[PDB]
Design a protein around this ligand. Structure first.
Ligand SMILES: C=C(C)CCOP(=O)(O)O
Ligand SMILES: C=C(C)CCOP(=O)(O)O
Lengths: 249, 260
């Protein structure tokens, strides 16, 4: 029923180019998601879908402006100005993505964490609204954002924080990570799987693909890391599976 | 003391001209909010301020396209386009308002109800982040928005729904209603004070046939203030300095006192 597809940095926007958008790729990714949803409408299978994207060439660039290094500590400053300016950037990127999805008749809607989510100790993140939206078969689109931290004051929640959380909070049947690599690379090769056995030797090797791997296990989750730039991977990924690294916890 | 300023009326936008923006009026208002914030710093007084605005010529016009009357009632349709459409329009208005407020160094941030609020017999509306934001001297700007309900449907949440709710949740001290009128008009004249010695006497008149507001607007504002045993002002937000004065607690319009 429920799937969480993450569109990770750099398939949507080049990081080394502030305010950049990879239009064709975005246009294609949106199409494959549509063709996927359609496929299921025939099989008459109810498939609830959530979407997550990063800060790409929007979130980061603007943030970097209010992050100062001091005593080896990432420090936000001038947040009187920084909070809005980061919000604003993520709002642009979020509109662009949602409009495109909408143009393919994907019933996407904006989820803006900065408005309600709180980091620190526990993760305060009321999924009430999201559950309802899913009951309507709407497709909530969540994005990395600036967010309050009741301990550190400010902090940047990312997709890696959001996906795992929601998958557990919402009991997701299938979680997908679209990236620019053919999966988790070991010695420059994508392992077909990651469980409870070879993991130990994997955490050492990696000593945020790690962060990602740990965040999902910390939730007995289970997801696929694949390449989003390969025409059809997303469409395949959603339908059942294609090539990529599997992570089961 | 925490204050809630409700922009409202048609002081920011002319509902008649779709996507209308009363720039001049919107800019002056930012000044005044600024003048006020600077004033509370000089007099060294702690103020937490929340702003709320409605849909103006943005929310309503778009929303109406997805509203139908069915069996003597309202129902949203095609919300697979409608929800985003209304979000989109509101997000624009919110941007314009916040960008401006910022252009006067007012630390405004965006609160988008559509993302987390559920409209039930009781609102589901986590105010954790807002509290932290106020804690850090940010100015949270909430706006009317589309939202899902807990009954297979959708609902429009307005400033009217948002203000009272927050007044309660956050235990506000002062409620400010910037409107298109000088106050609660009684004989085309803003009554100075409303309290537990005339409220009912006032409600009844508001309900009569010689009342200027038959939309039940003022009545609702009065009752929530009274319900939040706090204090509020109803004033003209189109007049120079009323918003500045109001924020200080001295705007000449109509006072509503039920604190203590
Ligand atoms: C940079 C911001 C605001 C969020 C970054 O998170 P990502 O989407 O994981 O890159
Ligand atoms: C029309 C929408 C989106 C809500 C408008 O809220 P209000 O103008 O405060 O009633």
């Amino acid at each position: 029923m429920l799937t969480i597809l993450k569109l990770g940095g750099s398939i949507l926007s080049d990081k080394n180019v502030p305010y950049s958008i990879k239009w064709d790729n975005l246009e294609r990714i949106a199409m494959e998601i549509k063709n996927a949803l359609d496929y299921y409408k025939n099989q008459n299978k109810e498939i609830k879908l959530i979407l997550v994207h990063g800060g790409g060439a929007f979130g980061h660039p603007v943030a970097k402006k209010y992050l100062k290094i001091e005593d080896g500590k990432k420090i936000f400053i001038n947040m009187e100005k920084g909070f809005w300016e980061i919000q604003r950037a993520m709002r642009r990127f979020n509109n662009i993505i949602i409009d495109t999805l909408q143009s393919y008749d994907i019933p996407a809607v904006s989820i803006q964490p900065s408005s309600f989510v709180v980091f620190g100790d526990k993760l305060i993140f009321d999924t009430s609204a999201i559950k309802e939206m899913l009951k309507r078969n709407l497709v909530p689109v969540i994005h990395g954002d600036i967010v309050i931290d009741d301990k550190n004051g400010y902090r940047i929640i990312s997709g890696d924080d959001i996906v795992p959380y929601l998958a557990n909070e919402l009991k997701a049947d299938l979680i997908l990570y679209a990236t620019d690599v053919d999966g988790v690379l070991i010695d420059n090769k994508p392992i077909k799987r990651i469980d409870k056995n070879n993991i130990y030797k994997i955490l050492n090797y990696l000593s945020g693909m790690k962060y990602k791997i740990e965040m999902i296990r910390k939730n007995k989750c289970r997801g696929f890391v694949f390449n989003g730039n390969k025409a059809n991977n997303i469409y395949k990924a959603l339908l059942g599976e294609v090539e990529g690294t599997e992570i089961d916890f």
